[PDB]
Design an enzyme around this catalytic site. Structure first.
Site, PDB file in Angstrom:
ATOM      1  N   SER A 263       2.184  18.076  17.948  1.00 16.59           N
ATOM      2  CA  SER A 263       3.242  18.111  18.939  1.00 16.59           C
ATOM      3  C   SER A 263       2.826  18.985  20.114  1.00 16.59           C
ATOM      4  O   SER A 263       1.946  19.839  20.005  1.00 16.59           O
ATOM      5  CB  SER A 263       4.538  18.644  18.340  1.00 16.59           C
ATOM      6  N   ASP A 264       3.466  18.758  21.253  1.00 22.14           N
ATOM      7  CA  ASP A 264       3.330  19.704  22.341  1.00 22.14           C
ATOM      8  C   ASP A 264       4.000  21.022  21.948  1.00 22.14           C
ATOM      9  O   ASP A 264       4.701  21.114  20.935  1.00 22.14           O
ATOM     10  CB  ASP A 264       3.934  19.132  23.620  1.00 22.14           C
ATOM     11  N   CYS A 265       3.779  22.060  22.750  1.00 19.61           N
ATOM     12  CA  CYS A 265       4.214  23.416  22.397  1.00 19.61           C
ATOM     13  C   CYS A 265       5.513  23.734  23.135  1.00 19.61           C
ATOM     14  O   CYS A 265       5.487  24.068  24.321  1.00 19.61           O
ATOM     15  CB  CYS A 265       3.120  24.430  22.731  1.00 19.61           C
TER      16      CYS A 265
END
Ligand SMILES: *[C@@H]1O[C@H](CO)[C@@H](O[C@@H]2O[C@H](CO)[C@@H](O[C@@H]3O[C@H](CO[C@H]4O[C@H](CO)[C@@H](O)[C@H](O)[C@@H]4O)[C@@H](O)[C@H](O[C@H]4O[C@H](CO)[C@@H](O)[C@H](O)[C@@H]4O[C@H]4O[C@H](CO)[C@@H](O)[C@H](O)[C@@H]4O)[C@@H]3O)[C@H](O)[C@H]2NC(C)=O)[C@H](O)[C@H]1NC(C)=O
Ligand SMILES: *[C@@H]1O[C@H](CO)[C@@H](O[C@@H]2O[C@H](CO)[C@@H](O)[C@H](O)[C@H]2NC(C)=O)[C@H](O)[C@H]1NC(C)=O
Ligand SMILES: *[C@@H]1O[C@H](CO)[C@@H](O)[C@H](O)[C@H]1NC(C)=O
Ligand SMILES: *[C@@H]1O[C@H](CO)[C@@H](O)[C@H](O)[C@H]1NC(C)=O
Ligand SMILES: *[C@@H]1O[C@H](CO)[C@@H](O)[C@H](O)[C@H]1NC(C)=O
Ligand SMILES: *[C@@H]1O[C@H](CO)[C@@H](O)[C@H](O)[C@H]1NC(C)=O
EC number: 3.2.1.37
Length: 742
Positions: A263-265
């Site tokens: 996932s993105d942060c």
């Protein structure tokens, strides 16, 4: 705290994870089978805690490599104190040189391995960004290969291969991560935050523009990881979107076996807040995992998967799947077992090649050259007898050269410093800032211009206007820079006035275009550590420009014409069409524009129609190609002759258009190929050979299917469209990509 497990004398020496003869998947599976539930959950985030009792080191999934070791555990001095900082991807892509991208990626991967051998860097990198610069206000467009998905696809392939190495399945150099998947092209425009954005995209646009490059990254470049975006698409957060992750990426696009999704942060958390797709952090974690997001950047998974288990949202096997994927990639990278001997000296050598400088020189675009004022040759303007005025908020730029994120660089060469090193007498004056309303600095700027033989104004935009979390609202020149530029033009008195328009996004320079006293206009993007030398050398003619625009320079009113959150490429409502492919308005400088310090004659190679049958071409063999869509169906050829007085590289874009093949609306044109011929000597006639794959001829129906239709296509060389070829496709329409359903 980055180290390697001891598979010879460590607690794992007796287990299959340490048996170099087993399959990578089985090794990783046994390793996970040695964990407890708490130990397993402790390694579901980017900052994986490891397992101490087993001698398993902590591992950090988040490493930055977009345009160099942009973030690593640097030393304060000596070894591992710096790493090469290349231009931002937007500038490199404008050189239209695939091998350049590949070499940059390979150098980055070498230095990354060197730092990882020293414990200062990971084995997988959150690069490349392969979204497209669809709307000109995007604050991260500098990090993309431009607005054209084909260029993004080629960039993805070259970069991912350079990063991963020649044998990604068995001896992986570094794992790459294609990002951001998918539909992520806006940061915060008009408070439409990426964290909460729910973008409406037609299946047609999804298939034709937003996904294709990720298909290439998966099938052709065999990328080991993909990052799902913060935003939602048609009501579903990307990291909770089983359609994006399983149906398309894993089932259609050819994602490598056991590839892992990050996932993105932190997009997993945003599933809960602010998207509201899940009612709790535990539910958000379970939904992300079940859709296919194996590893969380953040702590949502690691702090709330116990709640997920307790609420019956998933099972331990569900959690094990993602960790097993991640460590399968690590096993393929030799983690538990060539690249392990790379060291600091390799960083010094690769940096010393100065591929960063070469990328800048190759990518810089010459937009205007009135009366061949440029180049300012060392003969016409000798350094010892010349004073140059260096004015503008970019004239003293050092960190500005490196773009949004950067690590320790060996050096940062300002334009001022570069002209000084050459022996020019330089009068520097900031004049004004990026977005200032004061005129207090004008007088010093004008004074520096008055005493000078040549005036170099360096300005535009930078990360105070365009960055992650920071979209532009205007695409006009900011501040009062245009006012100062005009004052400089009025007082110039036939002295050469060279304007340097910097930044990732474009700015409306129509004012400078029609201003006779403005001698030359160049676009420099974010030119990297040696930007000053590259700009100086282009201005002096020590290097000759050949870059072209990979983004359209729209009129300012474009940014007010329709909502930037409109994802529809084709004209609709007040949207005039987006990107060169569909834009029905009049651009200031067009996508693909670029001038040269010499004249090139473009002639037809055979002083002629090309008739081909859909079924014949599509039933052929395609050895060494994963799909028949990659098969060259013709070569676009022309003769390029250097009719000028300087040797120069030459760049070409081939465009296609149709009016009958497939459904309307019909595109203005689309890019089907490009090339760069190096060092064309004076008078030489070199031949242009651009293969045109059958995929370039396909068009996308509303169901998202890629279909080859019968009809007439026109292929034209560059924007002048002098050399042209007609391609008539006969037969019956055939589907070359069957878009899946939900
Ligand atoms: C599209 O883009 C590609 C780039 O990917 C480009 O090809 C590249 O061309 C450049 C320019 O000739 C090459 O740059 C040189 O590379 C050598 C080392 O290359 C070796 O290793 C690579 C990678 O494995 C191999 O591919 C390659 O074939 C070689 O085996 C460097 O040593 C060179 O550095 C010197 O020159 C630089 C200026 O060009 C200096 O800045 C630098 O400091 C070095 O100076 C040398 O001389 C100094 C005295 O003058 C001395 O003081 C120094 O100590 C030093 O000895 C140079 O960087 C590059 O290798 C090519 N890459 C590939 C993959 O082929 C294409 O040309 C381009 N196409 C276009 C533009 O149409
Ligand atoms: C080519 O690479 C060399 C590698 O060092 C660059 O030379 C360095 O430049 C910085 C900044 O001017 C100096 O502080 C160093 O002392 C230089 N080192 C050496 C060994 O000369 C050089 O600038 C590069 N050429 C470019 C970027 O055009
Ligand atoms: C950086 O790396 C050195 C050498 O591996 C190590 O001693 C130091 O603790 C590291 N610092 C970090 C990871 O913040
Ligand atoms: C779940 O795990 C997190 C992280 O270790 C911890 O902070 C939390 O207290 C745990 N909850 C329960 C109910 O054990
Ligand atoms: C120019 O840049 C150098 C290096 O960062 C800095 O020391 C100097 O103060 C700058 N000058 C101005 C006028 O900003
Ligand atoms: C393009 O040119 C190459 C080299 O001349 C040739 O082998 C190839 O067949 C050509 N592509 C065609 C004819 O589609």
């Amino acid at each position: 705290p980055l180290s390697f497990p001891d598979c010879q004398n460590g607690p794992l020496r007796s287990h299959l994870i340490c048996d170099e003869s087993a399959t990578p998947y089985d090794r990783a599976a046994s390793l996970i089978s040695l964990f407890t539930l708490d130990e397993l959950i402790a390694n579901t985030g980017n900052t994986g805690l490891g397992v101490s009792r087993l001698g398993l080191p902590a591992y950090q999934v988040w490493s930055a490599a977009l345009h160099g070791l942009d973030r690593a555990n640097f030393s304060d001095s000596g070894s591992y104190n710096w790493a090469t900082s290349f231009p931002q991807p937007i500038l490199t892509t404008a050189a239209l040189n695939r091998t350049l991208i590949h070499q940059i990626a390979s150098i980055i991967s070498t230095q990354g391995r060197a730092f990882n051998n020293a414990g200062r860097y990971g084995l997988d990198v959150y690069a490349p960004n392969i979204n497209t610069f669809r709307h000109p206000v995007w604050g991260r467009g500098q990090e993309t290969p431009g607005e054209d998905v084909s260029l993004a696809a080629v960039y993805a392939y070259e970069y991912i291969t350079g990063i991963q190495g020649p044998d990604p399945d068995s001896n992986l150099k570094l794992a790459a991560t294609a990002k951001h998947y998918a539909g992520y092209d806006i940061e915060n425009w008009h408070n439409h935050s990426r964290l909460g954005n729910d973008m409406n995209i037609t299946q047609q646009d999804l298939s034709e523009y937003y996904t294709p490059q990720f298909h290439v990254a998966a099938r052709d470049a065999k990328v080991h990881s993909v990052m799902c975006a913060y935003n939602a698409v048609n009501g579903v957060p990307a990291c909770a979107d089983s359609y994006f992750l399983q149906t398309l990426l894993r089932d259609t696009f050819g994602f490598v076996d056991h590839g892992y999704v990050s996932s993105d942060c932190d997009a997993a958390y945003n599933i809960y807040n602010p998207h509201g797709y899940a009612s709790s952090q535990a539910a958000a974690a379970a939904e992300a995992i079940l859709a296919g997001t194996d590893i969380d950047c953040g702590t949502t998974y690691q702090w709330h998967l116990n709640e997920s288990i307790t609420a019956g949202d998933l099972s331990r096997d569900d959690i094990e799947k993602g960790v097993i994927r991640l460590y399968t990639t690590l096993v393929q990278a030799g983690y538990f077992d060539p690249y392990r001997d790379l060291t600091w000296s390799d960083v010094v050598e690769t940096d010393a090649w100065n591929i960063s400088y070469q990328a800048a020189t190759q990518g810089i675009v010459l937009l205007k050259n009135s009366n061949n004022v440029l180049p300012l040759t060392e003969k016409a303007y000798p350094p010892s007898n010349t004073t140059v005025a260096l004015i503008g908020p970019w004239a003293n730029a050092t960190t500005q050269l490196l773009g949004n994120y950067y690590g320790n660089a060996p050096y940062m060469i300002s334009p001022r410093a570069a002209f000084e090193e050459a022996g020019y007498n330089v009068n520097f004056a900031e004049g004004t800032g990026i977005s200032s309303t004061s005129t207090s600095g004008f007088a010093a700027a004008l004074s520096a211009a008055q005493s000078a033989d040549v005036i170099i104004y360096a300005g535009g935009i930078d990360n105070t206007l365009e960055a992650e979390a920071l979209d532009r609202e205007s695409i006009a020149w900011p501040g009062n820079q245009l006012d100062l530029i005009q004052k400089l033009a009025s007082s110039a008195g036939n002295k050469p006035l060279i304007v340097l328009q910097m930044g990732g996004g474009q700015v409306d320079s129509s004012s400078l275009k029609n201003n006779t006293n403005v001698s030359a206009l160049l676009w420099g993007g974010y030119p990297g550590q040696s930007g000053g030398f590259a700009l100086r050398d282009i201005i002096t003619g020590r290097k000759n420009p050949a870059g072209r625009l990979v983004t359209t320079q729209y009129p300012a009113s474009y940014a007010e014409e329709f909502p930037a959150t409109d994802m529809n490429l084709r004209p609709e409502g007040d949207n005039p069409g987006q990107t060169y492919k569909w834009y029905t308005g009049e651009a200031v400088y067009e996508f693909g524009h670029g001038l040269f310090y010499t004249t090139f004659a473009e002639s037809s190679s055979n002083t002629r129609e090309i008739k081909l049958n859909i079924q014949d071409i599509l039933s052929q063999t395609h050895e060494d190609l994963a799909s028949i869509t990659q098969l060259p169906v013709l070569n676009f050829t022309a003769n390029i002759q250097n009719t000028g007085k300087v040797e120069s590289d030459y760049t070409a874009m081939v465009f296609a258009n149709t009016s009958d093949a497939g459904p309307a609306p019909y595109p203005v044109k689309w890019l089907v190929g490009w090339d760069r011929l190096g060092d064309v000597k004076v008078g030489e006639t070199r031949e242009l050979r651009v293969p045109i794959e059958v995929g370039s001829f396909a068009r996308v129906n509303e169901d998202g299917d890629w279909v080859l239709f019968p009809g007439t296509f026109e292929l034209g060389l560059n924007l002048e469209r002098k050399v042209r070829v007609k391609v008539v496709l006969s037969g019956e329409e055939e589907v070359v990509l069957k878009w899946p359903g939900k």
